[PDB]
């Protein structure tokens, strides 16, 4: 779920929110902050 072909994965939502200032729906804001609470390595691939 949240395939990147749809515009709802964490990376596209974070890039639209931070770079382009297009803040998503408040549910997706909860999802992005839940991903930031989860932690992880969000950098370039490979």
């Amino acid at each position: 779920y949240r395939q990147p072909k749809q515009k709802l994965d964490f990376y596209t939502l974070l890039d639209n929110w931070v770079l382009r200032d297009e803040a998503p729906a408040v549910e997706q804001q909860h999802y992005v902050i839940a991903n930031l609470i989860r932690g992880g390595v969000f950098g370039e691939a490979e």
């Binding site: 931070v18 770079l19 804001q29 909860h30 902050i33 930031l36 609470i37």
Partner: protein, 49 residues
């Protein structure tokens, strides 16, 4: 539960770091962690673990 959930532990760009910090700050000021803590408290309440 620790807190400080917006600050990265390692970053390249300082400008992107400041923009991300202020974006999480505007999220927190619009609404707190209450919805997320409500769902985490539910997952603590039902023994999903």
């Amino acid at each position: 539960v620790l807190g400080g959930a917006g600050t990265p532990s390692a970053c390249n760009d300082a400008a992107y770091r400041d923009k991300l910090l202020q974006t999480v700050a505007t999220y927190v000021n619009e609404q707190g962690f209450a919805e997320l803590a409500r769902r985490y408290a539910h997952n603590l309440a039902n023994a999903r673990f």
